[PDB]
mmCIF file with all atom_site columns, C-alpha atoms and ligand atoms in Angstrom:
data_model
loop_
_atom_site.group_PDB
_atom_site.id
_atom_site.type_symbol
_atom_site.label_atom_id
_atom_site.label_alt_id
_atom_site.label_comp_id
_atom_site.label_asym_id
_atom_site.label_entity_id
_atom_site.label_seq_id
_atom_site.pdbx_PDB_ins_code
_atom_site.Cartn_x
_atom_site.Cartn_y
_atom_site.Cartn_z
_atom_site.occupancy
_atom_site.B_iso_or_equiv
_atom_site.pdbx_formal_charge
_atom_site.auth_seq_id
_atom_site.auth_comp_id
_atom_site.auth_asym_id
_atom_site.auth_atom_id
_atom_site.pdbx_PDB_model_num
ATOM   1   C CA . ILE A 1 1  ? -43.101 11.950  48.468  1.00 39.75 ? 1  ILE A CA 1
ATOM   2   C CA . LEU A 1 2  ? -46.819 13.070  48.005  1.00 39.15 ? 2  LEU A CA 1
ATOM   3   C CA . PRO A 1 3  ? -47.966 11.913  44.779  1.00 40.27 ? 3  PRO A CA 1
ATOM   4   C CA . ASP A 1 4  ? -48.092 14.737  41.975  1.00 40.64 ? 4  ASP A CA 1
ATOM   5   C CA . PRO A 1 5  ? -51.620 15.086  40.190  1.00 39.07 ? 5  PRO A CA 1
ATOM   6   C CA . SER A 1 6  ? -49.856 16.088  36.971  1.00 37.66 ? 6  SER A CA 1
ATOM   7   C CA . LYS A 1 7  ? -48.807 12.463  36.189  1.00 39.03 ? 7  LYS A CA 1
ATOM   8   C CA . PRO A 1 8  ? -51.880 10.013  35.148  1.00 41.77 ? 8  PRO A CA 1
ATOM   9   C CA . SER A 1 9  ? -50.252 7.474   37.364  1.00 43.79 ? 9  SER A CA 1
ATOM   10  C CA . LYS A 1 10 ? -51.004 9.383   40.681  1.00 46.22 ? 10 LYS A CA 1
ATOM   11  C CA . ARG A 1 11 ? -47.673 8.295   42.133  1.00 50.09 ? 11 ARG A CA 1
ATOM   12  C CA . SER A 1 12 ? -44.908 10.389  43.706  1.00 46.17 ? 12 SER A CA 1
ATOM   13  C CA . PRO A 1 13 ? -41.623 11.046  41.930  1.00 45.26 ? 13 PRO A CA 1
ATOM   14  C CA . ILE A 1 14 ? -39.700 8.641   44.094  1.00 43.14 ? 14 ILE A CA 1
ATOM   15  C CA . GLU A 1 15 ? -42.444 6.020   43.560  1.00 37.01 ? 15 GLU A CA 1
ATOM   16  C CA . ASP A 1 16 ? -42.082 6.523   39.725  1.00 35.21 ? 16 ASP A CA 1
ATOM   17  C CA . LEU A 1 17 ? -38.325 5.784   39.505  1.00 39.52 ? 17 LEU A CA 1
ATOM   18  C CA . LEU A 1 18 ? -38.754 2.732   41.501  1.00 40.42 ? 18 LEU A CA 1
ATOM   19  C CA . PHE A 1 19 ? -41.514 1.760   39.159  1.00 41.72 ? 19 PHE A CA 1
ATOM   20  C CA . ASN A 1 20 ? -39.181 2.337   36.428  1.00 39.99 ? 20 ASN A CA 1
ATOM   21  C CA . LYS A 1 21 ? -35.972 1.082   37.681  1.00 42.27 ? 21 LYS A CA 1
ATOM   22  C CA . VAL A 1 22 ? -37.314 -2.525  38.486  1.00 43.17 ? 22 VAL A CA 1
ATOM   23  C CA . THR A 1 23 ? -38.011 -4.660  34.955  1.00 49.08 ? 23 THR A CA 1
ATOM   24  C CA . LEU A 1 24 ? -38.906 -16.409 27.922  1.00 47.64 ? 24 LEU A CA 1
ATOM   25  C CA . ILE A 1 25 ? -39.027 -14.560 31.143  1.00 48.61 ? 25 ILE A CA 1
ATOM   26  C CA . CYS A 1 26 ? -42.949 -13.687 30.626  1.00 48.20 ? 26 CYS A CA 1
ATOM   27  C CA . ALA A 1 27 ? -43.611 -15.580 27.427  1.00 48.98 ? 27 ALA A CA 1
ATOM   28  C CA . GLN A 1 28 ? -44.315 -19.126 28.245  1.00 52.03 ? 28 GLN A CA 1
ATOM   29  C CA . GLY B 2 1  ? -2.222  -22.241 -14.215 1.00 49.58 ? 1  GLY B CA 1
ATOM   30  C CA . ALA B 2 2  ? -1.653  -20.190 -11.433 1.00 47.89 ? 2  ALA B CA 1
ATOM   31  C CA . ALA B 2 3  ? -3.742  -21.489 -8.522  1.00 44.89 ? 3  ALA B CA 1
ATOM   32  C CA . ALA B 2 4  ? -3.626  -22.466 -4.878  1.00 43.63 ? 4  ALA B CA 1
ATOM   33  C CA . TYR B 2 5  ? -5.440  -24.325 -2.495  1.00 42.53 ? 5  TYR B CA 1
ATOM   34  C CA . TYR B 2 6  ? -6.164  -24.950 1.486   1.00 40.70 ? 6  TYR B CA 1
ATOM   35  C CA . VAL B 2 7  ? -6.177  -28.073 3.108   1.00 40.75 ? 7  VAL B CA 1
ATOM   36  C CA . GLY B 2 8  ? -7.718  -28.680 6.769   1.00 42.29 ? 8  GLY B CA 1
ATOM   37  C CA . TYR B 2 9  ? -8.962  -31.252 9.010   1.00 41.92 ? 9  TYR B CA 1
ATOM   38  C CA . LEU B 2 10 ? -12.065 -31.988 11.401  1.00 41.91 ? 10 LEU B CA 1
ATOM   39  C CA . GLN B 2 11 ? -11.965 -33.570 15.015  1.00 45.15 ? 11 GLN B CA 1
ATOM   40  C CA . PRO B 2 12 ? -15.133 -33.849 17.467  1.00 42.66 ? 12 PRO B CA 1
ATOM   41  C CA . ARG B 2 13 ? -15.811 -30.807 19.410  1.00 43.55 ? 13 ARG B CA 1
ATOM   42  C CA . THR B 2 14 ? -18.945 -29.557 21.527  1.00 48.70 ? 14 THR B CA 1
ATOM   43  C CA . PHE B 2 15 ? -19.726 -25.910 20.823  1.00 47.94 ? 15 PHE B CA 1
ATOM   44  C CA . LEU B 2 16 ? -22.870 -23.476 21.369  1.00 46.99 ? 16 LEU B CA 1
ATOM   45  C CA . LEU B 2 17 ? -23.324 -21.209 18.354  1.00 44.98 ? 17 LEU B CA 1
ATOM   46  C CA . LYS B 2 18 ? -25.559 -18.314 18.050  1.00 45.85 ? 18 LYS B CA 1
ATOM   47  C CA . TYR B 2 19 ? -27.898 -17.003 15.366  1.00 42.91 ? 19 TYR B CA 1
ATOM   48  C CA . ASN B 2 20 ? -29.668 -13.880 14.769  1.00 41.14 ? 20 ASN B CA 1
ATOM   49  C CA . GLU B 2 21 ? -33.421 -13.092 13.707  1.00 40.91 ? 21 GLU B CA 1
ATOM   50  C CA . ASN B 2 22 ? -32.663 -13.942 9.870   1.00 40.01 ? 22 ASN B CA 1
ATOM   51  C CA . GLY B 2 23 ? -31.053 -17.046 10.848  1.00 40.80 ? 23 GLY B CA 1
ATOM   52  C CA . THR B 2 24 ? -27.448 -16.223 9.696   1.00 45.51 ? 24 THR B CA 1
ATOM   53  C CA . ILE B 2 25 ? -24.792 -17.810 11.690  1.00 43.65 ? 25 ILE B CA 1
ATOM   54  C CA . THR B 2 26 ? -23.524 -15.140 13.704  1.00 44.98 ? 26 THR B CA 1
ATOM   55  C CA . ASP B 2 27 ? -20.961 -16.492 16.202  1.00 40.80 ? 27 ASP B CA 1
ATOM   56  C CA . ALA B 2 28 ? -19.307 -19.607 16.708  1.00 39.01 ? 28 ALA B CA 1
ATOM   57  C CA . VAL B 2 29 ? -17.562 -19.962 19.766  1.00 39.49 ? 29 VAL B CA 1
ATOM   58  C CA . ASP B 2 30 ? -14.768 -22.355 20.858  1.00 38.41 ? 30 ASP B CA 1
ATOM   59  C CA . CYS B 2 31 ? -14.868 -24.301 24.133  1.00 35.79 ? 31 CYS B CA 1
ATOM   60  C CA . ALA B 2 32 ? -11.076 -25.060 23.642  1.00 35.67 ? 32 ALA B CA 1
ATOM   61  C CA . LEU B 2 33 ? -9.766  -21.423 23.696  1.00 33.43 ? 33 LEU B CA 1
ATOM   62  C CA . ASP B 2 34 ? -10.001 -20.566 27.247  1.00 34.82 ? 34 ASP B CA 1
ATOM   63  C CA . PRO B 2 35 ? -11.995 -21.159 30.480  1.00 35.50 ? 35 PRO B CA 1
ATOM   64  C CA . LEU B 2 36 ? -13.359 -17.428 29.947  1.00 35.16 ? 36 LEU B CA 1
ATOM   65  C CA . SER B 2 37 ? -15.561 -18.294 27.144  1.00 37.27 ? 37 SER B CA 1
ATOM   66  C CA . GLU B 2 38 ? -16.994 -21.394 29.193  1.00 35.83 ? 38 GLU B CA 1
ATOM   67  C CA . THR B 2 39 ? -17.660 -18.778 31.727  1.00 36.81 ? 39 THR B CA 1
ATOM   68  C CA . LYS B 2 40 ? -20.274 -16.870 29.594  1.00 36.83 ? 40 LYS B CA 1
ATOM   69  C CA . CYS B 2 41 ? -21.313 -20.497 28.066  1.00 38.93 ? 41 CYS B CA 1
ATOM   70  C CA . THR B 2 42 ? -22.515 -21.791 31.438  1.00 37.81 ? 42 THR B CA 1
ATOM   71  C CA . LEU B 2 43 ? -23.642 -18.421 32.724  1.00 36.35 ? 43 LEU B CA 1
ATOM   72  C CA . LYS B 2 44 ? -25.898 -18.155 29.471  1.00 36.72 ? 44 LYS B CA 1
ATOM   73  C CA . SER B 2 45 ? -25.508 -14.587 28.795  1.00 39.18 ? 45 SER B CA 1
ATOM   74  C CA . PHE B 2 46 ? -22.854 -12.462 27.159  1.00 39.24 ? 46 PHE B CA 1
ATOM   75  C CA . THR B 2 47 ? -22.638 -9.778  29.535  1.00 38.34 ? 47 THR B CA 1
ATOM   76  C CA . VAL B 2 48 ? -20.715 -10.397 32.960  1.00 34.43 ? 48 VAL B CA 1
ATOM   77  C CA . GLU B 2 49 ? -20.922 -8.209  35.967  1.00 32.76 ? 49 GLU B CA 1
ATOM   78  C CA . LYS B 2 50 ? -18.314 -7.698  38.816  1.00 36.46 ? 50 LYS B CA 1
ATOM   79  C CA . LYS C 3 1  ? -39.565 -16.645 4.662   1.00 41.18 ? 1  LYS C CA 1
ATOM   80  C CA . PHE C 3 2  ? -35.908 -15.761 5.243   1.00 43.75 ? 2  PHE C CA 1
ATOM   81  C CA . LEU C 3 3  ? -33.555 -18.358 3.798   1.00 44.81 ? 3  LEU C CA 1
ATOM   82  C CA . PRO C 3 4  ? -34.279 -21.727 1.776   1.00 47.38 ? 4  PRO C CA 1
ATOM   83  C CA . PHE C 3 5  ? -32.256 -24.467 3.723   1.00 47.62 ? 5  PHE C CA 1
ATOM   84  C CA . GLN C 3 6  ? -33.950 -23.364 6.828   1.00 46.45 ? 6  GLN C CA 1
ATOM   85  C CA . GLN C 3 7  ? -37.567 -22.049 7.394   1.00 47.10 ? 7  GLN C CA 1
ATOM   86  C CA . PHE C 3 8  ? -39.244 -23.405 10.643  1.00 45.72 ? 8  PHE C CA 1
ATOM   87  C CA . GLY C 3 9  ? -39.390 -20.471 12.852  1.00 47.18 ? 9  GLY C CA 1
ATOM   88  C CA . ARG C 3 10 ? -39.248 -20.531 16.435  1.00 45.42 ? 10 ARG C CA 1
ATOM   89  C CA . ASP C 3 11 ? -37.944 -17.808 19.045  1.00 46.45 ? 11 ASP C CA 1
ATOM   90  C CA . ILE C 3 12 ? -37.904 -18.983 22.681  1.00 48.64 ? 12 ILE C CA 1
ATOM   91  C CA . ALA C 3 13 ? -38.821 -22.148 23.785  1.00 51.39 ? 13 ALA C CA 1
ATOM   92  C CA . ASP C 3 14 ? -42.314 -23.349 22.255  1.00 53.12 ? 14 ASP C CA 1
ATOM   93  C CA . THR C 3 15 ? -43.643 -20.472 20.208  1.00 54.77 ? 15 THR C CA 1
ATOM   94  C CA . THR C 3 16 ? -42.938 -22.519 16.707  1.00 55.89 ? 16 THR C CA 1
ATOM   95  C CA . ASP C 3 17 ? -44.076 -20.160 14.509  1.00 52.49 ? 17 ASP C CA 1
ATOM   96  C CA . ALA C 3 18 ? -44.359 -22.677 11.642  1.00 51.10 ? 18 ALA C CA 1
ATOM   97  C CA . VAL C 3 19 ? -46.265 -25.738 10.843  1.00 52.34 ? 19 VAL C CA 1
ATOM   98  C CA . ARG C 3 20 ? -43.574 -28.452 10.159  1.00 53.57 ? 20 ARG C CA 1
ATOM   99  C CA . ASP C 3 21 ? -42.574 -28.434 6.724   1.00 52.49 ? 21 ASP C CA 1
ATOM   100 C CA . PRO C 3 22 ? -44.848 -27.363 3.725   1.00 51.64 ? 22 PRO C CA 1
ATOM   101 C CA . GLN C 3 23 ? -43.692 -27.173 0.146   1.00 49.13 ? 23 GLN C CA 1
ATOM   102 C CA . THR C 3 24 ? -44.630 -23.488 0.187   1.00 47.91 ? 24 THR C CA 1
ATOM   103 C CA . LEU C 3 25 ? -43.149 -23.158 3.665   1.00 51.14 ? 25 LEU C CA 1
ATOM   104 C CA . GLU C 3 26 ? -43.246 -19.636 5.244   1.00 52.87 ? 26 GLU C CA 1
ATOM   105 C CA . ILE C 3 27 ? -44.158 -18.621 8.510   1.00 48.75 ? 27 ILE C CA 1
ATOM   106 C CA . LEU C 3 28 ? -47.048 -16.438 9.797   1.00 46.38 ? 28 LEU C CA 1
ATOM   107 C CA . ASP C 3 29 ? -48.020 -16.834 13.505  1.00 46.84 ? 29 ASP C CA 1
ATOM   108 C CA . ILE C 3 30 ? -49.252 -19.302 16.026  1.00 44.62 ? 30 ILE C CA 1
ATOM   109 C CA . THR C 3 31 ? -52.680 -19.845 17.139  1.00 43.01 ? 31 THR C CA 1
ATOM   110 C CA . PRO C 3 32 ? -53.520 -23.551 17.872  1.00 46.02 ? 32 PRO C CA 1
ATOM   111 C CA . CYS C 3 33 ? -55.559 -23.037 21.255  1.00 45.72 ? 33 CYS C CA 1
ATOM   112 C CA . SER C 3 34 ? -55.406 -21.220 24.123  1.00 45.23 ? 34 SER C CA 1
ATOM   113 C CA . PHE C 3 35 ? -57.562 -21.168 27.332  1.00 43.93 ? 35 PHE C CA 1
ATOM   114 C CA . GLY C 3 36 ? -57.441 -21.524 31.058  1.00 45.13 ? 36 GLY C CA 1
ATOM   115 C CA . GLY C 3 37 ? -58.877 -22.601 34.277  1.00 49.53 ? 37 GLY C CA 1
ATOM   116 C CA . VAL C 3 38 ? -62.032 -21.842 36.150  1.00 47.44 ? 38 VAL C CA 1
ATOM   117 C CA . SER C 3 39 ? -63.329 -21.233 39.601  1.00 41.80 ? 39 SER C CA 1
ATOM   118 C CA . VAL C 3 40 ? -66.676 -21.068 41.707  1.00 44.03 ? 40 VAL C CA 1
ATOM   119 C CA . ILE C 3 41 ? -67.815 -17.822 43.754  1.00 43.27 ? 41 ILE C CA 1
ATOM   120 C CA . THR C 3 42 ? -69.864 -18.929 46.490  1.00 46.43 ? 42 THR C CA 1
ATOM   121 C CA . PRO C 3 43 ? -71.570 -17.048 49.312  1.00 47.92 ? 43 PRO C CA 1
ATOM   122 C CA . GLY C 3 44 ? -72.523 -19.983 51.717  1.00 45.79 ? 44 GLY C CA 1
ATOM   123 C CA . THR C 3 45 ? -74.751 -23.291 51.201  1.00 43.67 ? 45 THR C CA 1
ATOM   124 C CA . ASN C 3 46 ? -77.027 -22.118 54.600  1.00 39.57 ? 46 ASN C CA 1
ATOM   125 C CA . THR C 3 47 ? -76.895 -18.302 52.821  1.00 39.39 ? 47 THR C CA 1
ATOM   126 C CA . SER C 3 48 ? -77.967 -19.213 49.400  1.00 38.65 ? 48 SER C CA 1
ATOM   127 C CA . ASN C 3 49 ? -77.990 -22.017 46.595  1.00 38.48 ? 49 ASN C CA 1
HETATM 128 C C1 . LIG D 4 .  ? -31.563 -10.651 7.326   1.00 35.45 ? 1  LIG D C1 1
HETATM 129 O O1 . LIG D 4 .  ? -32.046 -9.737  7.847   1.00 35.45 ? 1  LIG D O1 1
HETATM 130 C C2 . LIG D 4 .  ? -33.084 -8.891  6.963   1.00 35.45 ? 1  LIG D C2 1
HETATM 131 C C3 . LIG D 4 .  ? -34.563 -9.789  7.230   1.00 35.45 ? 1  LIG D C3 1
HETATM 132 O O2 . LIG D 4 .  ? -35.484 -9.129  7.721   1.00 35.45 ? 1  LIG D O2 1
HETATM 133 C C4 . LIG D 4 .  ? -32.876 -8.760  5.552   1.00 35.45 ? 1  LIG D C4 1
HETATM 134 O O3 . LIG D 4 .  ? -33.293 -7.844  5.011   1.00 35.45 ? 1  LIG D O3 1
HETATM 135 C C5 . LIG D 4 .  ? -31.018 -8.884  5.522   1.00 35.45 ? 1  LIG D C5 1
HETATM 136 O O4 . LIG D 4 .  ? -30.738 -8.581  4.478   1.00 35.45 ? 1  LIG D O4 1
HETATM 137 C C6 . LIG D 4 .  ? -30.690 -10.100 6.237   1.00 35.45 ? 1  LIG D C6 1
HETATM 138 N N1 . LIG D 4 .  ? -29.421 -9.838  6.740   1.00 35.45 ? 1  LIG D N1 1
HETATM 139 C C7 . LIG D 4 .  ? -28.856 -8.905  7.532   1.00 35.45 ? 1  LIG D C7 1
HETATM 140 C C8 . LIG D 4 .  ? -27.611 -8.686  7.880   1.00 35.45 ? 1  LIG D C8 1
HETATM 141 O O5 . LIG D 4 .  ? -29.756 -8.235  8.338   1.00 35.45 ? 1  LIG D O5 1
HETATM 142 C C1 . LIG D 4 .  ? -48.212 -26.232 -5.306  1.00 38.62 ? 2  LIG D C1 1
HETATM 143 O O1 . LIG D 4 .  ? -46.714 -26.143 -5.385  1.00 38.62 ? 2  LIG D O1 1
HETATM 144 C C2 . LIG D 4 .  ? -46.435 -24.918 -6.015  1.00 38.62 ? 2  LIG D C2 1
HETATM 145 C C3 . LIG D 4 .  ? -44.887 -24.780 -6.054  1.00 38.62 ? 2  LIG D C3 1
HETATM 146 O O2 . LIG D 4 .  ? -44.368 -24.635 -7.203  1.00 38.62 ? 2  LIG D O2 1
HETATM 147 C C4 . LIG D 4 .  ? -46.952 -23.609 -5.168  1.00 38.62 ? 2  LIG D C4 1
HETATM 148 O O3 . LIG D 4 .  ? -48.066 -23.102 -5.814  1.00 38.62 ? 2  LIG D O3 1
HETATM 149 C C5 . LIG D 4 .  ? -47.716 -24.263 -3.880  1.00 38.62 ? 2  LIG D C5 1
HETATM 150 O O4 . LIG D 4 .  ? -46.684 -24.551 -3.000  1.00 38.62 ? 2  LIG D O4 1
HETATM 151 C C6 . LIG D 4 .  ? -48.728 -25.627 -3.928  1.00 38.62 ? 2  LIG D C6 1
HETATM 152 N N1 . LIG D 4 .  ? -49.873 -25.401 -3.980  1.00 38.62 ? 2  LIG D N1 1
HETATM 153 C C7 . LIG D 4 .  ? -50.674 -24.594 -4.992  1.00 38.62 ? 2  LIG D C7 1
HETATM 154 C C8 . LIG D 4 .  ? -52.183 -24.435 -5.010  1.00 38.62 ? 2  LIG D C8 1
HETATM 155 O O5 . LIG D 4 .  ? -49.845 -24.437 -6.050  1.00 38.62 ? 2  LIG D O5 1
HETATM 156 C C1 . LIG D 4 .  ? -76.335 -21.266 58.453  1.00 35.20 ? 3  LIG D C1 1
HETATM 157 O O1 . LIG D 4 .  ? -77.066 -20.010 59.090  1.00 35.20 ? 3  LIG D O1 1
HETATM 158 C C2 . LIG D 4 .  ? -78.127 -19.986 60.008  1.00 35.20 ? 3  LIG D C2 1
HETATM 159 C C3 . LIG D 4 .  ? -78.945 -18.728 60.501  1.00 35.20 ? 3  LIG D C3 1
HETATM 160 O O2 . LIG D 4 .  ? -77.503 -17.846 60.254  1.00 35.20 ? 3  LIG D O2 1
HETATM 161 C C4 . LIG D 4 .  ? -77.502 -20.846 61.041  1.00 35.20 ? 3  LIG D C4 1
HETATM 162 O O3 . LIG D 4 .  ? -78.738 -20.961 61.900  1.00 35.20 ? 3  LIG D O3 1
HETATM 163 C C5 . LIG D 4 .  ? -76.886 -22.040 60.700  1.00 35.20 ? 3  LIG D C5 1
HETATM 164 O O4 . LIG D 4 .  ? -76.124 -22.495 61.880  1.00 35.20 ? 3  LIG D O4 1
HETATM 165 C C6 . LIG D 4 .  ? -75.719 -21.817 59.779  1.00 35.20 ? 3  LIG D C6 1
HETATM 166 N N1 . LIG D 4 .  ? -75.404 -23.168 58.901  1.00 35.20 ? 3  LIG D N1 1
HETATM 167 C C7 . LIG D 4 .  ? -76.004 -23.887 58.537  1.00 35.20 ? 3  LIG D C7 1
HETATM 168 C C8 . LIG D 4 .  ? -75.177 -25.156 58.144  1.00 35.20 ? 3  LIG D C8 1
HETATM 169 O O5 . LIG D 4 .  ? -77.199 -23.950 58.264  1.00 35.20 ? 3  LIG D O5 1
#
C-alpha cells in the first residue's frame, strides 16, 4: 500500500495496477 | 473452344464495408444475412461481450 | 502513395492527410494551423493593475 521508492512513478504496487488497467477517442 | 461463363444480377442494398491501412477492401458485410451482423453494425465494434 | 484509384489519406474523422487531388497525388502529413485560447491572471484591481 505504501509507495515503493524503486519505481520512478513513486506509487504503490496496487496504485500502479490501477493506473495500468484504466485506459478518435483522444485525437480530435 | 472449351470455356465457361458466369451470370449474376445486382439489386439495391445498404452495407458497411471495411478497409485496412493500405486501402484494400477487406470485409464486405451483408445486412440480409442475419440480425446478428446488425448487432455489431449498430454497436460499431467487432467484439461483443456478455 | 498506396494505390492509384484511391489516394486521399484520412484515418479517423477529420485528419485528412492529403490535400485534395494533385496530379502527383501522394500524402505526407497535416499541418494547416493549430492554436488555442487565452486567459488572464489578475491579483485584484484594488491590489494591483
Ligand atoms: C498493403 O500494405 C503495405 C503498405 O504498407 C504493402 O507493402 C502491402 O503489400 C499491401 N498489402 C498487404 C496485405 O499488406
Ligand atoms: C508534372 O507532371 C509530372 C507527371 O508526369 C510530374 O513531374 C509532376 O506531377 C508535375 N510537376 C513537375 C514539376 O514535373
Ligand atoms: C481594496 O483594498 C483596500 C485595502 O485593502 C480596501 O480598503 C478596499 O475596500 C478594497 N476594495 C476596493 C474596491 O478598493
